[PDB]
Tab-separated table of C-alpha atoms in Angstrom:
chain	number	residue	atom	x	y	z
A	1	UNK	CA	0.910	-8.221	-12.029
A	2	UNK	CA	0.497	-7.070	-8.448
A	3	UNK	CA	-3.142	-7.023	-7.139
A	4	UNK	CA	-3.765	-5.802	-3.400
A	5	UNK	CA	-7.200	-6.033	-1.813
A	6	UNK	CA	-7.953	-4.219	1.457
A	7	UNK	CA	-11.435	-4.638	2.623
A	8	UNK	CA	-13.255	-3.973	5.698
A	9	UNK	CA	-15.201	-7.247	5.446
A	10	UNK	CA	-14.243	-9.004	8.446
A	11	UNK	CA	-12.079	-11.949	6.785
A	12	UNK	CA	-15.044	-14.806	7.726
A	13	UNK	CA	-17.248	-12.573	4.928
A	14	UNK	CA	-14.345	-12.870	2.950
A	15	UNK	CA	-15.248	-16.659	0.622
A	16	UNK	CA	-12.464	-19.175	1.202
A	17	UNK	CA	-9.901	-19.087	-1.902
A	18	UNK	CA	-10.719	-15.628	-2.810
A	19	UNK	CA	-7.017	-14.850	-3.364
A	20	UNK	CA	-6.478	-18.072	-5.864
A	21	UNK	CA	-9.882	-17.093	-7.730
A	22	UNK	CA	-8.679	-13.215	-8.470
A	23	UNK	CA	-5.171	-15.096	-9.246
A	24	UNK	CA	-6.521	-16.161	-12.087
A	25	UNK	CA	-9.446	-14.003	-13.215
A	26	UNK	CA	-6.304	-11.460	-12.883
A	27	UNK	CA	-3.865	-13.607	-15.006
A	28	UNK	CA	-7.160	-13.834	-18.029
A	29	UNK	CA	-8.669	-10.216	-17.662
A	30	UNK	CA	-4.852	-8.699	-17.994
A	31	UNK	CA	-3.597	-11.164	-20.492
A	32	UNK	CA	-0.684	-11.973	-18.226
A	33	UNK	CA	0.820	-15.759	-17.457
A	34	UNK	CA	-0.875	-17.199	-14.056
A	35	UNK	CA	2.757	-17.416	-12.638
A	36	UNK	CA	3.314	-13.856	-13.131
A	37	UNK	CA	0.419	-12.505	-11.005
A	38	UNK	CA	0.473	-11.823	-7.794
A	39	UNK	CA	-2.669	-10.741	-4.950
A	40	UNK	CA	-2.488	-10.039	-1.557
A	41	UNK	CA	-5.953	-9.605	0.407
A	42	UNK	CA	-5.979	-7.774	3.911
A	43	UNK	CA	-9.672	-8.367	5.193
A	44	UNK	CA	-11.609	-7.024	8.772
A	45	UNK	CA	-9.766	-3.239	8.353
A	46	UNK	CA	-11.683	-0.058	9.002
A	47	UNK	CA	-12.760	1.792	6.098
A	48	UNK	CA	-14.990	4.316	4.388
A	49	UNK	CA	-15.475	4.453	0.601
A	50	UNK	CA	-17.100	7.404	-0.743
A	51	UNK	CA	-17.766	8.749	2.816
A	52	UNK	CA	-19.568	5.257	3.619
A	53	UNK	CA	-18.282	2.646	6.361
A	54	UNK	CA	-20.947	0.055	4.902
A	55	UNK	CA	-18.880	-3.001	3.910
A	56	UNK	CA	-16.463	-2.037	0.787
A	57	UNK	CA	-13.284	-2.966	-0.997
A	58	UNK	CA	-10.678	-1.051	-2.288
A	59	UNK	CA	-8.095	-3.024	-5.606
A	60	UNK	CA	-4.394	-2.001	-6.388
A	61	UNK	CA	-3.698	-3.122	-9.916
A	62	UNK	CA	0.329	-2.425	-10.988
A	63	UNK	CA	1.554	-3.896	-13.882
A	64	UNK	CA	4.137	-3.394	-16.997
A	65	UNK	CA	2.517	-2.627	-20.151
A	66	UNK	CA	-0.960	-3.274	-19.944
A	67	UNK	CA	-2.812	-0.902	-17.406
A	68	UNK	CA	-1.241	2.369	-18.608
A	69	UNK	CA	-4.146	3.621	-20.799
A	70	UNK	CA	-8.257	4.493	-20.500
A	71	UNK	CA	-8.798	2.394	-22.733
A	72	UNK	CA	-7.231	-0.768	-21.678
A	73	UNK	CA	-7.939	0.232	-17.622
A	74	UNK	CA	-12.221	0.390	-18.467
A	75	UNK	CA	-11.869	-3.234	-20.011
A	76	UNK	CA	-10.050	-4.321	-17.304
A	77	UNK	CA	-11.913	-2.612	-14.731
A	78	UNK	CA	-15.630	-3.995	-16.330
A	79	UNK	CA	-14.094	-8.047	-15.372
A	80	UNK	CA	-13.033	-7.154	-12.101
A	81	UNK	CA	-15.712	-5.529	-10.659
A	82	UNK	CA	-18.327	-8.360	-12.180
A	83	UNK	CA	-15.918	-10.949	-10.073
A	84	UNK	CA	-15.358	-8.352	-6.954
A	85	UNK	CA	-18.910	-7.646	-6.815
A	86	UNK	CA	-20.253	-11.393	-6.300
A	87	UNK	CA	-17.282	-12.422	-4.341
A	88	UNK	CA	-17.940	-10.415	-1.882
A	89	UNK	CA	-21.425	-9.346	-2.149
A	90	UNK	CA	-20.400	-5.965	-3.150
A	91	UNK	CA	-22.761	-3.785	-5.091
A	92	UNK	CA	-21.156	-1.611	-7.376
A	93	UNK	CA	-20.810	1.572	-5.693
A	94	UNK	CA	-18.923	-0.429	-3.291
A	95	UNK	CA	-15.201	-1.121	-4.806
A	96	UNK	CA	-12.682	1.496	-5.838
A	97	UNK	CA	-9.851	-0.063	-8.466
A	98	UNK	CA	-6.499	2.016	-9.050
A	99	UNK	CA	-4.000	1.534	-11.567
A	100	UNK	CA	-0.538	1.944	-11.353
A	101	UNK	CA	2.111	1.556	-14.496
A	102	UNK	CA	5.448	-0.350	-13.305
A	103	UNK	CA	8.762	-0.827	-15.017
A	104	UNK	CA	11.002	-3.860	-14.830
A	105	UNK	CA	13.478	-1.373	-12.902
A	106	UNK	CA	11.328	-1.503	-10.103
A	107	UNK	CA	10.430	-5.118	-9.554
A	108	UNK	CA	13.483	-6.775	-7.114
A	109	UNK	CA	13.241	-10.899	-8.001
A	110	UNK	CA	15.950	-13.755	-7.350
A	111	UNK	CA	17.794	-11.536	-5.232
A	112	UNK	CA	18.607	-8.516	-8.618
A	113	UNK	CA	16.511	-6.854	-10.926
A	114	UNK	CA	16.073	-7.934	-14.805
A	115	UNK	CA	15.315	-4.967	-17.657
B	1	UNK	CA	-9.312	11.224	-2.384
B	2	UNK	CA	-7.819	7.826	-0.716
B	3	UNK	CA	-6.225	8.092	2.276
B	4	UNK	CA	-4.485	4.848	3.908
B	5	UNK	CA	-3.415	4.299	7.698
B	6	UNK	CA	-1.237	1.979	9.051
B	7	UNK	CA	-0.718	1.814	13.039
B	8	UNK	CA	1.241	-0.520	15.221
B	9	UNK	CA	-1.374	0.618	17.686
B	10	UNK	CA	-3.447	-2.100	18.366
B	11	UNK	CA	-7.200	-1.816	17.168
B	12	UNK	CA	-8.418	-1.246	20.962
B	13	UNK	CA	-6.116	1.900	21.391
B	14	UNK	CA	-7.542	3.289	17.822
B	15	UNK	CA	-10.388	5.160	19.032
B	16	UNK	CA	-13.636	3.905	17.475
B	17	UNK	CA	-14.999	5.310	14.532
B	18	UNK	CA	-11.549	7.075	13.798
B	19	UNK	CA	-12.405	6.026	9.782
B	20	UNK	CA	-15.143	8.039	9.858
B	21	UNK	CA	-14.218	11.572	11.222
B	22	UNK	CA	-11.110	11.059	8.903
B	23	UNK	CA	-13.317	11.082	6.187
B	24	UNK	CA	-14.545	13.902	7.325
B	25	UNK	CA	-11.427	15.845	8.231
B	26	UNK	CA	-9.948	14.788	4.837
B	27	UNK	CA	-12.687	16.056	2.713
B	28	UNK	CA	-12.594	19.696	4.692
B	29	UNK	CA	-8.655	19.501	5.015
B	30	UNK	CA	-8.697	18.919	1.024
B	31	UNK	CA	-11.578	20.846	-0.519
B	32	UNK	CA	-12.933	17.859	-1.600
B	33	UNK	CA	-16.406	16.676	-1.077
B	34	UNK	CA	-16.918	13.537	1.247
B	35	UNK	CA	-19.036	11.229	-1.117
B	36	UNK	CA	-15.811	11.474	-2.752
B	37	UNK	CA	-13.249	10.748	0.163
B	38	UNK	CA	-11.937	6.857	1.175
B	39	UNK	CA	-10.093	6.179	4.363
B	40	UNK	CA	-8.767	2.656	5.642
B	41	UNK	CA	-6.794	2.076	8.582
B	42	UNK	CA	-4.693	-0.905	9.442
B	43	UNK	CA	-4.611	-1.086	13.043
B	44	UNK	CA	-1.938	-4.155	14.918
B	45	UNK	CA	0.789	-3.758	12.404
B	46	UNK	CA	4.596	-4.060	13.289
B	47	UNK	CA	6.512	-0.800	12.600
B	48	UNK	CA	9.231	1.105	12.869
B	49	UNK	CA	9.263	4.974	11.826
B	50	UNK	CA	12.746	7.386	12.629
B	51	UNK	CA	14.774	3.902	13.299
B	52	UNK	CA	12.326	3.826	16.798
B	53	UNK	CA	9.814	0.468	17.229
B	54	UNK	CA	7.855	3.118	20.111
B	55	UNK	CA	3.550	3.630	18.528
B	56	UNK	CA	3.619	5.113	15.152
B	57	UNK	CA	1.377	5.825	12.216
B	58	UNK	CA	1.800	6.112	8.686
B	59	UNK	CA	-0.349	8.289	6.016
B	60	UNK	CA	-1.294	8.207	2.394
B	61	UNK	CA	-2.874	9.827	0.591
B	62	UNK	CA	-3.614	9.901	-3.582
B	63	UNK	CA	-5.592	12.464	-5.161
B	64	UNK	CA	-6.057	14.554	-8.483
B	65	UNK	CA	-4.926	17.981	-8.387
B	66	UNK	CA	-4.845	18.740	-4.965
B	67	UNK	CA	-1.356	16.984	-3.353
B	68	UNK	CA	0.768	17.461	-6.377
B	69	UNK	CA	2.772	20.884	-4.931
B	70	UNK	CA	4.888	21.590	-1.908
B	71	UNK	CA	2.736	24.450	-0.867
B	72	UNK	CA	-0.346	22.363	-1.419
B	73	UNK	CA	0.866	19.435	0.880
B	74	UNK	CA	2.465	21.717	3.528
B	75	UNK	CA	-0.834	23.511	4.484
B	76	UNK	CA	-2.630	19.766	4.616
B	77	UNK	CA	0.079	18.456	6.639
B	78	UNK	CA	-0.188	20.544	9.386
B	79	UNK	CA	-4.161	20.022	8.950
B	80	UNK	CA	-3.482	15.973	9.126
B	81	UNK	CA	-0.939	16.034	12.152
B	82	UNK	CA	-3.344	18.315	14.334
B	83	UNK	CA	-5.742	15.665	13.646
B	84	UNK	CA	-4.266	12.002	13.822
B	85	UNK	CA	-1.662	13.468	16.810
B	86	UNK	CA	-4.570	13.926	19.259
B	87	UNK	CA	-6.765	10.818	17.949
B	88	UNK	CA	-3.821	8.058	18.209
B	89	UNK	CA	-2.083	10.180	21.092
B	90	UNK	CA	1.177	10.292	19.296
B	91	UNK	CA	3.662	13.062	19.267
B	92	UNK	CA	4.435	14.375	16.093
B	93	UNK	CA	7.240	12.629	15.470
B	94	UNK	CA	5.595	9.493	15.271
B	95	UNK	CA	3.911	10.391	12.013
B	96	UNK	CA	4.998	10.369	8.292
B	97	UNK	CA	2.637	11.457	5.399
B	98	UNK	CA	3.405	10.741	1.840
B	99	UNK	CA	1.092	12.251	-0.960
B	100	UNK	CA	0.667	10.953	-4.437
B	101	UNK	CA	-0.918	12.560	-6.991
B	102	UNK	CA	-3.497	10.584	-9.453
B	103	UNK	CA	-5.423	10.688	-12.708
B	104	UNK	CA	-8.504	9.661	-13.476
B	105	UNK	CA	-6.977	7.144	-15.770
B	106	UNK	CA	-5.875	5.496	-13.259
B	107	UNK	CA	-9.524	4.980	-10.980
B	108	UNK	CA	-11.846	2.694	-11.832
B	109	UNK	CA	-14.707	2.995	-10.124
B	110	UNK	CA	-19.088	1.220	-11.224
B	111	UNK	CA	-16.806	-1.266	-13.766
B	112	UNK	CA	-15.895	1.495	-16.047
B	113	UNK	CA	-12.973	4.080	-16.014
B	114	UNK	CA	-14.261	7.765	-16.228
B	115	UNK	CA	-11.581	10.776	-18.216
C	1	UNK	CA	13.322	5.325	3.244
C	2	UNK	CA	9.817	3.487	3.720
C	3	UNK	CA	9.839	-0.301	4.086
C	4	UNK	CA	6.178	-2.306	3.838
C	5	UNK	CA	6.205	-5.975	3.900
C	6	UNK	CA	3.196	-7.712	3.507
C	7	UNK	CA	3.015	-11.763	4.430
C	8	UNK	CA	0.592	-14.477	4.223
C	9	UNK	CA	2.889	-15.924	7.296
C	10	UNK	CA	0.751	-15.753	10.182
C	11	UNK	CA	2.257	-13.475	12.934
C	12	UNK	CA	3.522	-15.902	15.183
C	13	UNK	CA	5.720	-17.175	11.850
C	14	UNK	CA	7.576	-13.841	11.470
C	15	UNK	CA	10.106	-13.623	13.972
C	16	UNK	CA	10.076	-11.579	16.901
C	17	UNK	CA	11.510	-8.138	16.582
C	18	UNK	CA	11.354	-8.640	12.310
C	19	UNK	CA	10.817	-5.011	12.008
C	20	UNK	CA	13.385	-3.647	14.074
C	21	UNK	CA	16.517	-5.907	11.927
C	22	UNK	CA	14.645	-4.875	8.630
C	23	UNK	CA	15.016	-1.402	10.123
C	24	UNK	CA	18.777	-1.788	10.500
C	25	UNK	CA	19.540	-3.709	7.217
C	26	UNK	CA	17.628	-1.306	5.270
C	27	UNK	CA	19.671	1.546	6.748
C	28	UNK	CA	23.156	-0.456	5.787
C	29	UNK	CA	21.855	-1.644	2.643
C	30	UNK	CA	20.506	1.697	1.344
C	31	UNK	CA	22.959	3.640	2.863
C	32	UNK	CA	20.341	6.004	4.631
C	33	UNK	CA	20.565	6.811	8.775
C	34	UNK	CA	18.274	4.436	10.494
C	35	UNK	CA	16.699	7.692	11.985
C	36	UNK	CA	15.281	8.111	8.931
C	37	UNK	CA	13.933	4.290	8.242
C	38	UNK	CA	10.371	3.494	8.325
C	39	UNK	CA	9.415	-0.349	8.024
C	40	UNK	CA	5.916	-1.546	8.520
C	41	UNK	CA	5.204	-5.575	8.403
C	42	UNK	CA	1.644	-6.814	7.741
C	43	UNK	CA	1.107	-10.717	8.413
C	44	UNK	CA	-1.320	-13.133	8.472
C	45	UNK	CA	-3.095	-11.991	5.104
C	46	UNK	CA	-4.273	-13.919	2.338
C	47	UNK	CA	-1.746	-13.816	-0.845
C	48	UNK	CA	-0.514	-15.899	-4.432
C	49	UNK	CA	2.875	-14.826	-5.704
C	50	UNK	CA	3.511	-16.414	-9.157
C	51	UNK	CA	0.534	-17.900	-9.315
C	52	UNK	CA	1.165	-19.663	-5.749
C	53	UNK	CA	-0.566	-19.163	-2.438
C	54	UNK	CA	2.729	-21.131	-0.724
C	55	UNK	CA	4.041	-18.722	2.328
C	56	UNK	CA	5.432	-16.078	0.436
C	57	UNK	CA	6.128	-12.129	0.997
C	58	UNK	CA	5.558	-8.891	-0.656
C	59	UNK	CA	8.481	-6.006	-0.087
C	60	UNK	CA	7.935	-2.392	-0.825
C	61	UNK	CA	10.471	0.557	-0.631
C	62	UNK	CA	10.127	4.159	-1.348
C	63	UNK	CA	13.409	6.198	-0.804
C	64	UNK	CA	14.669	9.525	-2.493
C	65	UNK	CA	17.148	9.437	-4.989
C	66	UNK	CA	18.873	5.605	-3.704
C	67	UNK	CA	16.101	3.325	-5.428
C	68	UNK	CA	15.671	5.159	-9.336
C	69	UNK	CA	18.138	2.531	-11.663
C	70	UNK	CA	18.418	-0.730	-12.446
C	71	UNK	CA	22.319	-1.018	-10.914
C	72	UNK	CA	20.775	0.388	-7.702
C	73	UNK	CA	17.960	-1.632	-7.345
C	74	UNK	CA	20.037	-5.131	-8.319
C	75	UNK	CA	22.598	-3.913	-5.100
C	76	UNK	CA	19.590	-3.642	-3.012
C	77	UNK	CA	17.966	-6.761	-4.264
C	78	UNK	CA	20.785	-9.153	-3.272
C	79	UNK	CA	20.842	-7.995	0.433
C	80	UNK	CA	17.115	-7.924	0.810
C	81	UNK	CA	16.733	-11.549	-0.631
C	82	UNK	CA	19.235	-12.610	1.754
C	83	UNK	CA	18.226	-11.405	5.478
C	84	UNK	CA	14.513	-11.733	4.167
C	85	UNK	CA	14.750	-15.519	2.540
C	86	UNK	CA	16.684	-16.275	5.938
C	87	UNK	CA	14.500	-14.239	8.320
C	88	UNK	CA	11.151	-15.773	7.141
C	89	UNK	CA	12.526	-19.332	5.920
C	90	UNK	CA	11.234	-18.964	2.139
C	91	UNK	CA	12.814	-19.761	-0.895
C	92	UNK	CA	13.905	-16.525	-3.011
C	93	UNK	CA	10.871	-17.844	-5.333
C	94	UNK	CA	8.970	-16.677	-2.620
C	95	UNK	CA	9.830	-12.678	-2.220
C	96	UNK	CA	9.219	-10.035	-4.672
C	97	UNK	CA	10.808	-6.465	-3.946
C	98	UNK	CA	9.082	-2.856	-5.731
C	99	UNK	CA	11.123	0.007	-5.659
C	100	UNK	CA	9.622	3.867	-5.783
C	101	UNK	CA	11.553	6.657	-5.688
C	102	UNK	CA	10.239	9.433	-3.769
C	103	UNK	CA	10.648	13.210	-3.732
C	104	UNK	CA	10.669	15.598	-0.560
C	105	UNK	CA	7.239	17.216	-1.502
C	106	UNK	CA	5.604	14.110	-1.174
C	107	UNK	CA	6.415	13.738	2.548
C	108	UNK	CA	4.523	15.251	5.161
C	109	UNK	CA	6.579	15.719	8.238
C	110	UNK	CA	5.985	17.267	11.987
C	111	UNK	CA	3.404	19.297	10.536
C	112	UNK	CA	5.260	20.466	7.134
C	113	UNK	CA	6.819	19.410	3.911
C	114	UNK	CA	9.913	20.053	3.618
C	115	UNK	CA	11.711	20.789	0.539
């Protein structure tokens, strides 16, 4: 999986470790091996969420398989936001989470591509 | 909507509060109202755009319904470039826009997903 | 085409002038004018790729028509993995490419779309 994290949180009100933590809440909540996930965090940005500049946090999920559906997107999307929120002292109303379907078509690794 | 900025301008020639008239020009620009609008800006990057390493900006933004058509986009681009030309005092050539559409399968958003 | 590289390589790490020989490879590689590359480079964040927060990077590229198969994408793949392994001294462990095609509504240019 490929979790990205932008956050206007400057990155000292961003805990220590937070990108190892989401590693692997990410690789239990989508059911995917630890060495298969991937997050990149990009803390003190400028940002409004929901026409708000208060401190907030937007998460890019992509993944093959498993975050293609309602169904499995709300399950995922109930553990991340009870992780996202205490991290980073978040309420709620306060983190966006998109989901984006990948194929193995897409994903460049070794130096080719495996299907 | 979720709009996304990044800049190889640094941070002190991105005029403050830029995130926040965005907002506003992006819920007026795309009929949509501005609880409902998300902006973040990544000021300090390294970037080329048009082969040329001169100050440049790039533009997202995902929505449902409203950036899925030609005709759609074309009357918010020219909204968009009126806009971020003047704030970042780039030419118009200095600016790319891509648009991508979303569901609301895709969002989630209080720990839930919402269809 | 649109390049984005994100690295938890702190700026001063990534070579000098990175995004202007990305700029030029990508045009070779892809076979696209570099008048109409677009690379962006974001250091210094916080990442884990494959479970490992080791130096590692994170390359995105969005292109019409070049980047939509497999055979494609495993061309590209090879040449990106081996200016970007070289360029920022990681392992090929250490990269991970996405590919997204693109279509001309999606891009917003000089005020239009063109299609």
């Amino acid at each position: 999986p490929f979790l990205e994290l932008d956050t206007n949180l400057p990155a000292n009100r961003v805990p220590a470790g937070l990108e190892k933590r989401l590693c692997a809440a990410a690789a239990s909540i989508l059911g995917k091996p630890a060495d298969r996930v991937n997050v990149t965090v990009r803390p003190g940005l400028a940002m409004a969420l929901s026409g708000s500049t208060e401190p907030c946090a937007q998460l890019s999920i992509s993944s093959i398989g498993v975050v293609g559906t309602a169904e499995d997107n709300r399950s995922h999307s109930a553990h991340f936001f009870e992780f996202l929120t205490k991290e980073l002292a978040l309420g709620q109303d306060r983190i966006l989470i998109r989901f984006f379907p990948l194929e193995s078509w897409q994903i460049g690794k070794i130096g080719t591509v495996m299907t």
